[PDB]
Amino acid sequence: TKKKLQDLVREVDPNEQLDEDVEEMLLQIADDFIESVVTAACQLARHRKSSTLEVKDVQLHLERQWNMWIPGFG
């Protein structure tokens, strides 16, 4: 469809190849990253007042352990 795995490789290094067995591992890395973020976000969601919302503002406070900052609104 669009941006499966190869165009992201071109986004960094124009001439780089990945083995067939490496692609699935990276997706599982992303799959584990997705679950870890949402579980922690839901934990903070239940911490605001026992539950409020999935909030983009508290996600910024969550990314301090990942040492990353989204260029979003905030």
Partner: peptide, 19 residues
């Protein structure tokens, strides 16, 4: 907005792995 932030976080994380 939360869905978009998660998607971009995954995109940045995978870029860090390949870098």
């Amino acid at each position: 907005e939360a869905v978009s932030a998660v998607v971009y976080a995954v995109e940045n994380h995978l870029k860090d792995i390949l870098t």
